[PDB]
Ligand binder design. Structure first.
Ligand code: 0LA
Ligand code: 0LA
Ligand code: OHO
Ligand code: OHO
Ligand code: CL
Lengths: 544, 543
């Protein structure tokens, strides 16, 4: 535990970030000089579908779209620190973008863990600094074959096991709505950047909420597909081979139609031939565009994380609008939530007591946004056990988590994997007994204060459940925190009254004006229906 | 502590006996009322023409059902393939959806497909008297398509075996030759279908278990990608093991029957009964394509020396495919020994066999399992020491033994990641040669009863494709000639270990037995695997 390697890694990373920003700015200046007459705010505020259509007609050139968004990104980065790297070869890709690509001319931002040839994917960890990828990951190759132009890497919290957004290399990303707030994570850089208008489309990943937290905290749309709907080939992570709780990747954008367009672009022959392990399910457009009324299961609370007044209102309003539009709304709650989170989800993420994950931290600083996670994982199994016994009568949530963070044998992992498998069937059976099409749930919100997500773990209950179940789940911004909702946080107690409830209460205060989302869920492989429902919520709640 | 196990065998034996009595009484009544039915003509109809006549009304479902029931009862006399008669099937028979793609087709089920009110014992006494509360998903889908599941077929005890005997229902025999294994673990299906007792069956395959019995018994079989079909309600020994992928699929007399079965199963009913299965419908245009293929092939995997019959089968098919206009490209997946001894074995036994062993507490161990149970029971440190001792002389045994030790969750994660990088590695190696499909030997001809369990090395041709989770199927293409049999005198093996020695003896005295090749396509590519299989069948067995 000396820190000289970690300091040198930060110095190099900060230099590279600084020089990327300088290059971006030079390129933007050069462009703006050659084109002082371009209506840049008209271009930036076009919805993606309309941007794509003008690109396709020739009305906007790719260059103008690209450098206009580049300047916007450089500008919003000043207040958010969301961009870790400029993807330097993107000006060449711009000139070779295939004219028939579904995303021809579209600049796209990429969460830092998407391998991009020539660039680190540090995950904010010093051991990955100075080790550039030697190829584009598969989805990046597909984006490029669809004529998209990936142009920046966006920040993530250290090792990505977090829903905040700071690391010791690139520092802290900020919510563009309010700089005291987290932009969510681990796809926080994408949320910050997309939520301020600096990118029309990005890709994130999500193993416990990491597409959905930043999309909700920053006021944009996001979808986490079924884990094996899209290729994971070439994604950087901290731990490999953990398959109990399913990692997924997916789009973040300003509206639902953008998510659909991106999935449609990715789910093409190129993807399925580049990674044959992905079932070749094309995008089922007729499901996405369907207009039939739905049977919509819903819940207003999971009884685990007390929803904020603004979350609860967002959900009840959406429900009511969905009723009025003719959908049938049916109360529904997945069975045994506390078991799913405390045993299955926590147990699957940390089946080896965190040993693999800890290896990444050897000799490194631990970013304060992770709170006491590293400290606690380092405890020897017997002491976790003892502490878990001692906390059980006082703080049972904490005790259950702690016990599930213990290493175990492969025999016990199989047993866990089999329980995950039975649990997924138990929820599908509830769903089919009620004959649901989709499921409406609250989504954690408004944005928590910086540095509190790592100290409020129970609050992952709304999202992580669908990584456990491996169901597609998306979020759509539906309202903003009113002063009335905010004042009502003084009455919030949580269901448990433990440290997690106490932190969450304080962290959600001061949020007037912040966006608040609901989550839309469908069955495995039903991304298009999930999106069809999202589009409906978006239309109903935010018609204009 | 075997008294409970004895009781379980007595009860299972009485259920099997009653089942067979029930079947015979129903068959005799039917034959009496239909003395003129041409029962040979019906039994010899390819499944596709049988389906056609059922769909038109030309044959009634009753006629087809009782004729197969009678044939199943008779071939069972010589094979012991049937464990149970699925009693309510006569009622299913009457309500069978007239529009289903399988309307009126009798279908046999390996015993591990749960059927309401029936045990799936897997030959184990702890599962006797534990009847299932409902039909598993694929059985529900088969009935919704108008098929009539009618028997459960035998499997080796626990199913972790490619022979076919257990202490409840006893031993299943190859129908071509009664001293030969029918293969397994889907051996009851191989014996039943390979003798004309059933036109379509479902088996399961974690290391070759659809492919061994189809090859040994001279029928076709397809192991799809592991998650192409629903595994919901399948009975198993060990649950939660997901490194090496279990797959389920059809067995039948011809390729077209496999394709018709896959196409019936891949329908909205399956996709909504089990939403965890990607809803990929059967792509008929892929299956019916007639474009020339780039076909990779090997004659040996350099791990298990092929029998002369296997080698000849492989070369002959290769030559035919060349003469029909396909490009044949030497190709051998890289690092097979690692895939077998480290990935496959470690994947199947990551816990040192602890969970598997719990099924055997208090039970007999069928002889067809060999010393598997004895070896898994050894302390980890002892497995390690023997491994170290065996290594300079017998590296295969040593590597397997080492991989059957219990390991930690952390190490299983590392194994799971190695399996996934190995899979990307072979896929990369396949695309660099621009292969459409791959042709390989398939183990055969059938081994002597009670030798599969002592010749584990012989799993190398099949389990590789469970490890990689590629669709793979088998097609009978030739029969052993007196020349192929005599050349077994010269059989050496690459290792000269005890597995080479057992296998050499086990494959002799086989003149006249069927021998297959194996066809492989990339993941999710069942329709192309089948097109390729249909081509092999058409070129090698034209009439
Ligand atoms: C007690 C400690 C804390 O809340 O400070 C703690 C306990 C559990 C977790 C954590 C931090 N940070 C986490 C992140 C993910 C998961 Cl699954 C569990 C935890
Ligand atoms: C030593 C003993 C034998 O050769 O009979 C043995 C050793 C390994 C295995 C086996 C039997 N039976 C098996 C079945 C599957 C696997 Cl992966 C390994 C084995
Ligand atoms: C992204 O999915 N972030 C997750 C937050 C909860 C624990 C795992 C990581
Ligand atoms: C069927 O898949 N049987 C397998 C044979 C080899 C050992 C695993 C079980
Ligand atoms: Cl899958």
């Amino acid at each position: 535990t000396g820190r000289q390697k970690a300091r040198g890694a930060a110095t190099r990373a900060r230099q590279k970030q600084r020089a990327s920003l300088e290059t971006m700015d030079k390129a933007v200046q050069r462009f703006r000089l050659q084109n002082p007459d371009l209506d840049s705010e008209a271009l930036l505020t076009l919805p993606l579908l309309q941007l794509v259509q003008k690109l396709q007609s020739g009305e906007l050139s790719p260059e103008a779209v690209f450098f206009t968004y580049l300047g916007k990104a450089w500008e919003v980065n000043k207040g958010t620190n969301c961009v870790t790297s400029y993807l330097t070869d993107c000006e060449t890709q711009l000139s070779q973008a295939p004219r028939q690509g579904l995303l021809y001319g579209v600049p796209v931002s990429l969460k830092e863990c998407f391998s991009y040839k020539g660039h680190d994917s540090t995950l904010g960890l010093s051991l990955n600094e100075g080790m550039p990828s030697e190829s584009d990951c598969v989805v990046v190759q597909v984006l490029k074959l669809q004529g998209a132009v990936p142009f920046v890497h966006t920040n993530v919290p250290q090792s990505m096991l977090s829903f905040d957004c700071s690391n010791p290399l690139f520092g802290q990303t900020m919510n563009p709505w309010k700089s005291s707030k987290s932009p969510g994570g681990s796809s926080g850089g994408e949320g910050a950047l997309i939520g301020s208008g600096g990118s029309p489309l990005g890709l994130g990943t999500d193993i416990g909420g990491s597409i959905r937290f930043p999309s909700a905290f920053c006021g944009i749309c996001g979808l986490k597909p079924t884990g094996n709907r899209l290729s994971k080939s070439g994604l950087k992570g901290c731990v490999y081979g953990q398959t109990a709780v399913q990692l997924s990747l997916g789009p973040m954008a300003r509206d639902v139609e953008s998510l659909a367009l991106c999935l449609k672009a990715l789910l093409c022959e190129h993807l399925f031939t580049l990674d044959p392990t992905v079932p070749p399910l094309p995008f089922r457009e007729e499901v996405y565009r369907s207009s039939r009324p739905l049977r919509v299961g819903y819940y207003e609370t999971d009884n685990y994380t007390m929803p904020s007044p603004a979350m609860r209102r967002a959900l009840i309003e959406t429900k009511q609008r969905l009723e009025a539009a003719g959908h049938t709304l049916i109360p529904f709650l997945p069975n045994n939530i506390p078991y799913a989170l405390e045993v299955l989800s926590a147990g699957g993420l940390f089946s080896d007591g965190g040993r693999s994950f800890l290896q990444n931290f050897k000799g490194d600083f631990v970013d304060p946004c992770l709170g006491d996670l590293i400290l606690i994982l380092r405890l020897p199994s017997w002491f976790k056990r003892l502490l878990s016994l001692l906390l059980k009568p006082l703080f049972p949530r904490l005790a259950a988590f702690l016990n599930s963070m213990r290493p175990r044998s492969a025999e016990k992992l199989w047993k866990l994997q089999h329980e995950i498998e039975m649990y997924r069937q138990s929820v599908i059976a509830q769903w089919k007994a009620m004959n649901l099409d989709v499921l409406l749930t609250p989504m954690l919100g408004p944005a928590l204060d910086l540095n509190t997500p790592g100290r409020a773990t129970g609050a992952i209950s709304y999202t992580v459940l669908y990584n456990c179940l491996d169901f597609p789940a998306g979020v759509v911004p539906v309202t903003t925190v009113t002063a009335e909702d905010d004042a009502q946080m003084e009455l919030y107690k949580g269901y448990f009254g433990d440290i997690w409830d106490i932190i969450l209460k304080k962290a959600m205060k001061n949020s007037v004006g912040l966006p608040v989302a609901v989550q839309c869920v469908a069955l495995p492989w039903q991304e298009e229906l999930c999106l069809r429902f999202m589009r409906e919520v978006e239309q109903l709640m935010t018609p204009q």
